Amino acid sequence: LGTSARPAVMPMDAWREGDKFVVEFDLPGIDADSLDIDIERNVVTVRAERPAVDPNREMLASERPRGVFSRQLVLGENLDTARIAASYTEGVLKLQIPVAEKAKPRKISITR
Amino acid sequence: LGTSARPAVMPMDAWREGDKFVVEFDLPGIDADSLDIDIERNVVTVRAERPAVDPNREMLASERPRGVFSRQLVLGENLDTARIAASYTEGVLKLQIPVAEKAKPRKISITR
Amino acid sequence: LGTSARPAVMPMDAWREGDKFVVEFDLPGIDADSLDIDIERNVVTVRAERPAVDPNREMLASERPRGVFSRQLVLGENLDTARIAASYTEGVLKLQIPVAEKAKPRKISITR
C-alpha cells in the first residue's frame, strides 16, 4: 500500500489546449472525500487515498493499488494556478489551469 | 525517437567559472532552427529536434538518437537568468549565466 | 499501445460475497461503446479500448495506457455465468456472477 512517505503514483496525461493547460490522472474508485488538491506558488500537488481491503475479507485476487496516491507538478510561471478548475468523472481527475502569458516575452538567440 | 512527452536527453557538463555559471550540452548535428532556449523565473529549458531519417532511406546503421531533445535546469536564486548568453559550436550548446550574489548572505551555523 | 494480439491488462480485485462472486477492474476513462463482455461456457473475457491520442496533438505528458485492454477469467463450474451482471461506474467495471453450488459436493479425504 502507498503511504504518505512512499505514495503510490498515478498515471498522468498533460497537454496545452490553446489558452489552457490540462492535466488528467487515472484515479478510479476514489472517494471524493479523499481527493485533495493543494496549490503552491507554482506547484500543484494531487493526493488521494483508496482504502485498504477489510483485513477480515479473503480476496481471491487483489491487484488494484491501494492506499495513498500522490503526484506533484512543478508548473511554469505563466500558469495562473489560483484559477485552477478540477473535476472528477469516470474515475479521471481533470485539472484545467489557465495560461497567462507575460507581456513581450524573452526569445533567446544563439550565436554561432 | 524522442518526443515532447518523452524527450531524448542530452549529456551536460556544468561548473562555476568565477562570476559566471556555465552549462554545456552535446547536441551534434542539430539545425539552429530547432534550438529553443526558454528561461523561466529560475528555470532554463533547452529543446532541440534532430529530424528522423527519410522513411524511404534504407540505413545500414542508424544508432544516432533522433527526434526531440530536452533538458530542464532548476537554477538558484543567485543566477541572473535574464542575462543568459548561448552559443552553438562544434555541436556543443554552451550557456553562460551571470552569477549575481545577494548582499550579506546567510551562513547557517550548526549546534552540537 | 495495447493491441488485440498484445493487449494491455487492467488490474483486478476478486472475492466471494456470500452467494455471489464479484470481480472489479480499474478501467478509467473508457467509452462504454468499447466495453465488451464475452461469456463462454465457464470463461469471462473483458475487452475495452481507450483511443490513442490525436497524432497531431503534442502531449507534454502521456503516461496513461491506451489501446486495447483485455483480461480473461477461467471460472469454476459452480458459477452461473449466464446470469452475469455488469456495471461501470467511477471508472470501475464490476461483474457479479451468482454462485450455484452443486448438490452434495465431493470432499476429498487424505490418507496418512
Binding site: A14, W15, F21, L73, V74, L75, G76, N78, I97 | - | -
Partner: peptide, 4 residues
C-alpha cells in the same frame, strides 16, 4: 503550458 509549462511544466517540469
Amino acid at each position: 503550458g509549462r511544466l517540469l
